[PDB]
Amino acid sequence: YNDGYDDDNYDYIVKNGEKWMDRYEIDSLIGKGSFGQVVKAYDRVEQEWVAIKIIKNKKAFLNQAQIEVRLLELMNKHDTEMKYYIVHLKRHFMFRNHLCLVFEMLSYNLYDLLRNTNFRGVSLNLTRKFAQQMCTALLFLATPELSIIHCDLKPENILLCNPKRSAIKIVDFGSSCQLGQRIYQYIQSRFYRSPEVLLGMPYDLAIDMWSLGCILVEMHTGEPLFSGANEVDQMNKIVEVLGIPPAHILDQAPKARKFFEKLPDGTWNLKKTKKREYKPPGTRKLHNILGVETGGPGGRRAGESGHTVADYLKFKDLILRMLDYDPKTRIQPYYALQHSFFKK
Ligand SMILES: COC(=O)c1ccc(Cl)c(NC(=O)c2cc3cnc(OC)nc3[nH]c2=O)c1
Incomplete structure (x- = not known):
């Protein structure tokens, strides 16, 4: 599944310690609903912890999270x-075919x-x-x-x-x-x-x-x-x-x-x-x-x-x-x- 990166549920198989994009250092899993997972991670570039919501690798799931992102961004930019x-959505990105939303911990x-x-x-x-x-x-x-x-x-x-x-x-x-x-x-x-x-x-x-x-x-x-x-x-x-x-x-x-x-x-x-x-x-x-x-x-x-x-x-x-x-x-x-x- 997803070249061995995902389990049989469309969820990314989290690995503690892993570093993504020479930036984020996954510590551990801290949340696992129907959307996918949420991990704790250090942002080397910003010198802070964040929570990363990893969306399921699955078209209906991703498509819906794209709506989450349009609304989060609209709320966050309102003065x-x-x-x-x-909650504050700092960034999002694609990684290993999952959408990932970066939040303040x-x-x-x-x-x-x-x-x-x-x-x-x-x-x-x-x-x-x-x-x-x-x-x-x-x-x-x-x-x-x-x-x-x-x-x-x-x-x-x-x-x-x-x-x-x-x-x-x-x-x-x-x-x-x-x-x-x-x-x-x-x-x-x-x-x-x-x-x-x-x-x-x-x-x-x-x-x-x-x-x-x-x-x-x-x-x-x-x-x-x-x-x-x-x-x-x-x-x-x-x-x-x-x-x-x-x-x-x-x-x-x-x-x-x-x-x-x-x-x-x-x-x-x-x-x-x-x-x-x-x-x-x-x-x-x-x-x-x-x-x-x-x-x-x-x-x-x-x-x-x-x-x-x-x-x-x-x-x-x-x-x-x-x-x-x-x-x-x-x-x-x-x-x-x-x-x-x-x-x-
Ligand atoms: C479905 O969850 C979401 O969409 C969502 C969206 C944005 C965020 Cl910032 C989260 N945050 C967390 O899940 C979260 C889980 C924690 C678990 N345990 C602890 O021990 C103190 N601290 C946590 N802090 C967190 O922020 C979740």
Whole structure:
């Protein structure tokens, strides 16, 4: 495969120590998703470490990363301090028939952070800071001459700048597109996937806000809010919390009948089944998941500072505005930043 340079998966067979182009000194592998791999490497020419995202040697994979690069370059050259919430693409190049993107090295991602605490969750204060950054990040992406949809927000694609501080950056625009230049129907990671996408409807930037909604709850509770094993499970878990999606949406949804049934009288219910598996629609209240009046998630924050019922009621209000079923009334970043959960 690729004159012995690649494994059977179209991935470059990384070798520690290797020096590419009399410049980069590959130390090791540090990331390996569906896109390919990410390695740690010393840039001799600039005297710094970098992360190198090695794209899979495969036409569909390369072609998509070419889109990542057009969008990364567009974000990076935009003069506004908000652009510092999106990671910096220093260079790209072809090497051994792989596209390679050279990035500033960042630190652990938010998933690693959750794991570091044994999934007890991070503080409501910390979560606030992440949320605050994310919404400013999304606000940047929403600027008209950008209008970029990330499409795969989740803890693993949000990284700490430095391991002991709380500045973060969004990475992985490998599934991103601009408004009106949509090309996939199946997108986002399942846990973080919006209802409009599960329903096969057209989507806009509001899908990132759904994802953020779910992420922030997870960051605080330490477990995914909606953890479906497949699309049918996913939509049922959402329903447990928010009830049946409103009729105006289902009526225009190609995949409505993958999960739902229209009744003679025009209302919608879940599909008939053989058999109890889910809580009744809307009876798994975000109010209890978060532990608003019971000392937070699991009771784990009972009488700690920064975790008042009033903090939680604010928080909860934001999340539910983020998980609005309707993409046209779901809270957009501008207004989310004005939310009272961010007062001082
Ligand atoms: C899919 O990932 C991407 O598109 C992407 C795009 C751009 C970047 Cl800068 C990355 N960065 C990393 O993966 C990365 C992984 C690390 C793992 N471990 C550690 O130990 C502290 N530090 C890391 N620092 C990193 O920057 C990833």
